[PDB]
Write a protein that binds this ligand. Structure first.
Ligand code: FB2
Length: 290
């Protein structure tokens, strides 16, 4: 964990440059340095206390550009720094961190829906491709549990997916896992205790409030309590043993709602609102800035 939940970028009318940090200990929001380039459909992660913004797309008045960018935010300095770019642009990307390395998974580049996966090494500032997924996935949820990488749901270019797969680093190999009970593109995916959670998303007809979790020991998905708001393209993270979901789109509104899940009581509650409604944000947790 750390201290603050950082939300970077997103979409409302066009792609956003916002970086804002929510503090669960006092309810406060802080606006921090803007991204250098607006982006929606990006992912956030943390390595060595630095916040990384990965991929996305700049949907803007003057044009639409898919992003291969990796950028690094240092809370100590309140400055963004560019890192090496990925091999390819990846809008509606998923990311996971294992052993201080960032895995970028799937996403789109125009009509190209990627199965490709690449890994960034911060000590070298270098990306390298690894084995591709067995399925093309954009709007894909990614999480890490016990140093294995999970890619969950998404859209393959033709169908929204209930399927999911796992990457075994030491074998450089992807294998299918049990599919979810619900088709979901754009779900929030995270890890808590021994389970991979998939919250919300879009099933082809409707934005979802349902939430299900995969127990790696049993290989089964089980529904838990649904969110209070239906939402796709939500941000998600974990902070002190609770899941937080941030924004997204419900078919009517770009949500400012932030919900918090308590796994012991199996209940969701609203904890704050974002300063403005948005979908397609990048979210991660690190130390408070100066
Ligand atoms: N990342 S976003 O702009 O919220 C988006 C979400 C779903 C489909 C297309 C775009």
């Amino acid at each position: 964990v750390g201290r603050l939940i950082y939300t970077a970028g997103g979409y409302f009318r066009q792609s956003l440059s916002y970086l804002e940090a929510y503090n669960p200990s006092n309810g406060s929001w802080l606006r921090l340095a803007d991204l250098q380039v607006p982006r929606s459909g990006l992912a956030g992660c943390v390595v060595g206390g630095l916040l990384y913004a990965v991929g996305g797309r700049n949907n803007s008045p003057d044009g639409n550009t898919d992003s291969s960018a990796l950028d690094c935010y240092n809370p100590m300095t309140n400055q963004w720094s560019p890192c090496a770019s990925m091999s390819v642009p990846r809008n509606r990307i998923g990311v996971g961190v294992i052993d201080g390395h960032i895995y970028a998974v799937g996403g789109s580049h125009g009509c190209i829906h990627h199965s490709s996966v690449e890994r960034y090494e911060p000590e070298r500032d270098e990306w390298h491709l690894v084995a591709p997924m067995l399925t093309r996935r954009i709007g894909v949820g990614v999480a890490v549990l016990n140093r294995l990488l999970y890619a969950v749901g998404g859209f393959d270019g033709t169908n929204r997916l209930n399927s999911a797969e796992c990457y075994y680093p030491e074998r450089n190999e992807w294998r299918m896992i049990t599919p979810m009970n619900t088709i979901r593109s754009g779900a929030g995916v995270c890890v808590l205790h021994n389970c991979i959670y998939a919250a919300g998303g879009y099933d082809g007809q409707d934005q979802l409030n349902s939430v299900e979790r995969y127990d790696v020991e049993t290989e089964t998905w089980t529904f838990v309590a649904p969110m209070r708001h239906h939402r796709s393209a939500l941000g998600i993270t974990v902070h002190q043993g609770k899941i937080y979901v941030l924004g997204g789109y419900d078919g009517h509104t770009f949500l400012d709602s932030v919900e918090c899940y308590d796994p012991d009581s199996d209940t969701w509650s609203e904890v704050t609102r974002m300063t403005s409604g948005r979908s397609g944000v990048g979210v991660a947790v690190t130390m408070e800035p100066c």
